[PDB]
Amino acid sequence: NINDALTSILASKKYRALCPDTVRRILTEEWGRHKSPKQTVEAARTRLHGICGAVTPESLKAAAAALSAGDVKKALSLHASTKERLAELDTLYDFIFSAETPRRVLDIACGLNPLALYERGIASVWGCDIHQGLGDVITPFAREKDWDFTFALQDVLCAPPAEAGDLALIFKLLPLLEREQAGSAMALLQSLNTPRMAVSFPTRSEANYAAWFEGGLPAEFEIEDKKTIGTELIYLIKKN
């Protein structure tokens, strides 16, 4: 059964820090599409390889160390997604916070980004992602600096965020969400308990993300702003 497999896969050194829901979700899908030789586990296993960062413990240790030495920048350099948004990082948050600076932010599929949020003087942050290694790095930090930050090992496709806040960050995620389960991308924005959200898509290869996002955004949402910064096309929207 699935629970047996989830248990085996989570035993591996390569996947032990993975959100159990994700492994299960993927196990379940690789089953109905196969009925398998049993080794659905293989399809799932190689599906989980690039389901997360493609994030090695090696980079993780390197981060929590870089971090413990005060070098936040480098810590961020050790995470792929954050590393490329690094150069135009400040321009990016000025764009986002320009109109209203949030007290509580909900960083969806946060990654190491929360660190960048600390250095922005954001008071409260709730971040979720599918790899425990991430929280392992940011929590001791937040603790060591009495910064109100909470990490949830959670897959937004099994359960949406139950938290509330002023802003929600959905950076380069909608595409991966939509590809895993049609219509789930917008469904995520609909269930986010925030009046504002910062969404983004990669500029490089919904061939045209702008045309898709703009074309499929629910009428309850409005686009207050749009701009490209570095490798991201950003959209500031408001939920009503």
Ligand X SMILES: Nc1nc2c(ncn2[C@@H]2O[C@H](COP(=O)(O)O)[C@@H](O)[C@H]2O)c(=O)[nH]1
Q: Does 111 bind ligand X (CB under 6 A)?
A: yes
Q: How far is the CB of 219 from ligand X (least distance, A)?
A: 25
On whether the CB atoms of residues 73 and 34 are closer than 8 A, the answer is no
The answer on whether 156 is annotated among ligand-binding residues is yes
The answer on whether 219 is annotated among ligand-binding residues is no
The answer on whether 155 is annotated among ligand-binding residues is yes
Q: Does 109 bind ligand X (CB under 6 A)?
A: yes
- Give the chain's length: 240
Q: Is 166 exposed, middle or buried (0-12, 13-18, 19+ CB in 10 A)?
A: middle
Residue 70 or 204: the one with the smaller Cβ distance to ligand X is: 204
Rule CB under 6 A: choose which of 155, 169, 197, 233 binds ligand X.
155
Please tell me the distance from the alpha carbon of residue 143 to that of residue 150, in angstroms, as a whole number: 10
Rule CB under 6 A: choose which of 172, 174, 198, 201 binds ligand X.
172
Q: How far is the CB of 3 from ligand X (least distance, A)?
A: 20
Residue 39 or 172: the one with the smaller Cβ distance to ligand X is: 172
The answer on whether 82 is annotated among ligand-binding residues is yes
**Three-class DSSP category at 154:** coil
Q: How far is the CB of 30 from ligand X (least distance, A)?
A: 16
On whether the CB atoms of residues 234 and 167 are closer than 8 A, the answer is no
Phi/psi at 226 (5° precision): -150, 140
Q: Does 185 bind ligand X (CB under 6 A)?
A: no
The answer on whether 181 is annotated among ligand-binding residues is no
Residue 5 or 173: the one with the smaller Cβ distance to ligand X is: 173
CA distances in angstroms from 71 to 77, 120, 151, 207, listed in the order given: 10, 15, 21, 38
Residues within the interface to ligand X (CB under 6 A): 52-53, 81, 109, 111, 128-131, 154-157, 171-173, 176
Binding residues for GMP: 79, 81, 129, 154, 156
